[PDB]
Coordinates of all heavy atoms in Angstrom, one line a residue:
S15 N 101.0 115.1 88.6 CA 101.8 114.9 89.7 C 102.8 115.9 89.8 O 103.2 116.6 88.8 CB 102.4 113.4 89.8 OG 103.6 113.4 89.0
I16 N 103.4 116.0 91.0 CA 104.5 116.9 91.3 C 105.5 116.3 92.4 O 105.0 115.8 93.3 CB 104.1 118.4 92.1 CG1 103.1 119.0 91.1 CG2 105.2 119.2 92.3 CD1 102.7 120.2 91.7
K17 N 106.6 116.0 91.9 CA 107.7 115.5 92.9 C 108.5 116.6 93.4 O 109.2 117.3 92.6 CB 108.5 114.3 92.2 CG 109.5 113.8 93.1 CD 109.8 112.4 92.7 CE 111.0 111.8 93.7 NZ 112.2 111.7 93.1
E18 N 108.5 116.9 94.7 CA 109.1 117.9 95.3 C 110.6 117.5 95.7 O 110.9 116.3 96.2 CB 108.5 118.3 96.6 CG 107.5 119.3 96.5 CD 107.3 120.2 97.7 OE1 108.1 119.9 98.6 OE2 106.5 121.1 97.8
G19 N 111.7 118.3 95.5 CA 113.0 118.1 95.9 C 113.6 119.2 96.6 O 112.9 120.3 97.0
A20 N 114.9 119.0 97.0 CA 115.6 120.0 97.7 C 115.8 121.2 96.9 O 115.4 122.3 97.3 CB 116.9 119.4 98.2
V21 N 116.1 121.1 95.7 CA 116.6 122.1 94.8 C 115.5 122.2 93.6 O 114.7 123.3 93.5 CB 117.9 122.0 94.2 CG1 118.4 123.2 93.6 CG2 118.9 121.4 95.2
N22 N 115.5 121.2 92.7 CA 114.3 121.2 91.7 C 113.3 120.3 91.9 O 113.4 119.3 93.0 CB 115.0 121.0 90.3 CG 116.0 121.9 90.0 OD1 115.8 123.0 89.9 ND2 117.2 121.5 89.5
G23 N 112.2 120.3 91.2 CA 111.2 119.3 91.2 C 110.8 118.8 89.8 O 111.4 119.4 88.9
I24 N 109.8 117.9 89.8 CA 109.3 117.4 88.6 C 107.8 117.5 88.5 O 107.1 116.8 89.3 CB 109.7 115.9 88.3 CG1 111.4 115.9 88.3 CG2 109.2 115.4 87.2 CD1 111.9 114.6 87.8
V25 N 107.2 118.2 87.7 CA 105.9 118.3 87.4 C 105.5 117.5 86.2 O 106.3 117.2 85.3 CB 105.2 119.7 87.3 CG1 106.0 120.6 88.1 CG2 105.5 120.3 85.8
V26 N 104.2 116.9 86.1 CA 103.8 116.1 85.0 C 102.5 116.5 84.6 O 101.5 116.6 85.4 CB 103.8 114.5 85.4 CG1 103.2 113.8 84.2 CG2 105.1 114.1 85.8
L27 N 102.3 116.8 83.4 CA 101.0 117.3 82.6 C 100.4 116.3 81.9 O 101.1 115.3 81.1 CB 101.3 118.5 81.7 CG 101.5 119.9 82.1 CD1 102.2 120.7 81.0 CD2 100.2 120.5 82.6
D28 N 99.1 116.2 81.9 CA 98.3 115.3 81.0 C 97.9 116.3 79.7 O 97.0 117.1 79.9 CB 97.0 114.8 81.8 CG 96.1 113.9 81.0 OD1 96.1 114.0 79.7 OD2 95.2 113.3 81.5
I29 N 98.5 116.0 78.7 CA 98.3 116.9 77.5 C 97.2 116.4 76.6 O 96.9 117.1 75.6 CB 99.7 117.0 76.8 CG1 100.2 115.9 76.1 CG2 100.7 117.9 77.6 CD1 101.2 116.2 75.2
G30 N 96.6 115.2 76.9 CA 95.5 114.8 76.2 C 95.9 113.8 75.0 O 96.9 114.0 74.4
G31 N 95.1 112.8 74.8 CA 95.4 111.7 73.9 C 96.2 110.6 74.5 O 96.9 110.1 73.7
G32 N 96.2 110.4 75.7 CA 97.2 109.5 76.4 C 98.7 109.9 76.3 O 99.5 109.1 76.4
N33 N 98.8 111.2 76.1 CA 100.2 111.8 76.1 C 100.4 112.6 77.3 O 99.5 113.3 77.8 CB 100.3 112.8 74.8 CG 100.5 112.0 73.5 OD1 101.3 111.0 73.5 ND2 99.6 112.2 72.4
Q34 N 101.6 112.5 77.9 CA 101.9 113.2 79.0 C 103.4 113.6 79.0 O 104.2 112.9 78.4 CB 101.6 112.5 80.3 CG 102.7 111.8 81.0 CD 102.4 110.7 82.1 OE1 101.2 110.6 82.5 NE2 103.4 110.0 82.6
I35 N 103.7 114.9 79.4 CA 104.9 115.4 79.5 C 105.3 115.7 81.0 O 104.4 116.1 81.7 CB 105.0 116.6 78.5 CG1 105.0 116.1 77.1 CG2 106.5 117.3 78.7 CD1 104.6 117.2 76.1
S36 N 106.6 115.5 81.3 CA 107.0 115.9 82.6 C 108.0 117.0 82.4 O 108.8 116.9 81.4 CB 107.5 114.5 83.3 OG 108.6 114.0 82.6
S37 N 108.2 117.9 83.5 CA 109.1 119.0 83.3 C 109.9 119.2 84.6 O 109.3 119.7 85.6 CB 108.2 120.4 82.9 OG 108.9 121.5 83.3
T38 N 111.0 118.9 84.5 CA 112.0 119.2 85.7 C 112.3 120.6 85.7 O 113.1 121.0 84.8 CB 113.2 118.3 85.6 OG1 112.8 116.9 85.9 CG2 114.1 118.6 86.9
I39 N 111.8 121.3 86.7 CA 112.1 122.8 86.8 C 112.5 123.0 88.4 O 112.4 122.1 89.2 CB 110.9 123.6 86.4 CG1 109.5 123.1 86.9 CG2 110.8 123.7 85.0 CD1 108.4 124.0 86.6
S40 N 112.9 124.2 88.6 CA 113.2 124.7 90.0 C 112.0 124.6 90.9 O 110.9 124.9 90.4 CB 113.7 126.0 90.1 OG 112.7 126.9 90.1
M41 N 112.1 124.3 92.1 CA 111.1 124.2 93.0 C 110.5 125.7 93.4 O 109.3 125.9 93.4 CB 111.5 123.6 94.3 CG 111.3 122.1 94.2 SD 109.7 121.5 93.9 CE 108.7 122.5 94.8
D42 N 111.5 126.7 93.4 CA 111.2 128.1 93.5 C 110.1 128.5 92.5 O 109.2 129.1 92.8 CB 112.4 128.9 93.5 CG 113.3 128.7 94.6 OD1 113.0 127.9 95.6 OD2 114.2 129.3 94.6
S43 N 110.3 128.0 91.2 CA 109.4 128.5 90.2 C 107.9 127.9 90.4 O 106.9 128.5 89.8 CB 109.9 128.4 88.8 OG 109.9 127.0 88.5
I44 N 107.9 126.6 90.9 CA 106.7 125.8 90.9 C 105.8 126.6 92.0 O 104.5 126.5 91.7 CB 107.0 124.5 91.5 CG1 107.8 123.6 90.4 CG2 105.7 123.7 91.6 CD1 108.3 122.5 90.7
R45 N 106.1 127.2 93.0 CA 105.2 127.8 93.9 C 104.9 129.2 93.3 O 103.7 129.5 93.3 CB 106.0 128.1 95.3 CG 106.6 126.8 95.8 CD 107.6 127.0 97.1 NE 108.3 125.7 97.0 CZ 109.6 125.7 97.4 NH1 110.2 127.0 97.8 NH2 110.3 124.6 97.3
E46 N 105.7 130.0 92.9 CA 105.4 131.3 92.2 C 104.3 131.3 91.3 O 103.4 132.1 91.3 CB 106.6 131.9 91.6 CG 106.5 133.3 91.1 CD 105.9 133.3 89.6 OE1 106.4 132.5 88.8 OE2 104.9 134.0 89.3
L47 N 104.2 130.3 90.5 CA 103.0 130.1 89.6 C 101.9 129.4 90.3 O 100.8 129.6 89.6 CB 103.4 129.2 88.4 CG 104.3 129.4 87.2 CD1 105.8 129.6 87.5 CD2 104.2 128.4 86.1
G48 N 102.0 128.9 91.4 CA 100.9 128.5 92.0 C 100.6 127.0 91.7 O 99.3 126.7 91.7
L49 N 101.5 126.2 91.1 CA 101.1 124.8 90.5 C 100.8 123.8 91.7 O 101.7 123.5 92.4 CB 102.3 124.5 89.7 CG 102.4 125.2 88.4 CD1 103.6 124.6 87.6 CD2 101.2 125.2 87.5
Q50 N 99.6 123.6 91.7 CA 99.0 122.2 92.5 C 98.3 121.4 91.6 O 98.0 121.7 90.5 CB 98.3 122.8 93.7 CG 99.1 123.1 94.9 CD 99.8 121.7 95.4 OE1 99.3 120.6 95.1 NE2 100.8 121.9 96.4
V51 N 98.0 120.1 92.0 CA 97.5 119.1 91.4 C 96.2 119.5 90.6 O 95.3 120.1 91.1 CB 97.3 117.8 92.1 CG1 96.0 118.0 93.0 CG2 97.0 116.6 91.2
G52 N 96.0 119.0 89.3 CA 94.9 119.3 88.5 C 94.9 120.7 87.9 O 93.8 120.9 87.1
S53 N 95.8 121.4 88.1 CA 95.8 122.9 87.6 C 96.1 122.9 86.1 O 96.8 122.2 85.5 CB 96.7 123.7 88.3 OG 98.1 123.4 88.1
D54 N 95.6 123.9 85.4 CA 95.9 124.2 84.0 C 97.1 124.9 83.7 O 97.4 126.1 84.2 CB 94.7 124.9 83.4 CG 93.3 124.2 83.3 OD1 93.4 123.0 83.4 OD2 92.3 124.8 83.3
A55 N 98.0 124.3 82.8 CA 99.3 124.9 82.5 C 99.7 124.4 81.1 O 99.1 123.4 80.6 CB 100.4 124.8 83.6

């Protein structure tokens, strides 16, 4: 998932094993890397 915000957003990764990490980062950086749903990071 990706939650979009005015300034920052929150991405969530499925790291495997029923473990998931969420990363609050700038929205500007989320586009530059091209992060859309299901992508590898």
Side-chain angles (χ1 to χ4, degrees):
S15 81
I16 300 180
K17 181 152 177 256
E18 282 205 0
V21 198
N22 298 312
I24 302 197
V25 317
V26 175
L27 285 161
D28 184 339
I29 63 166
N33 287 307
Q34 103 195 346
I35 292 161
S36 53
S37 158
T38 295
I39 46 173
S40 85
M41 281 291 333
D42 292 356
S43 72
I44 295 172
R45 304 171 208 144
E46 183 274 311
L47 288 64
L49 285 183
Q50 274 291 346
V51 72
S53 66
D54 288 341

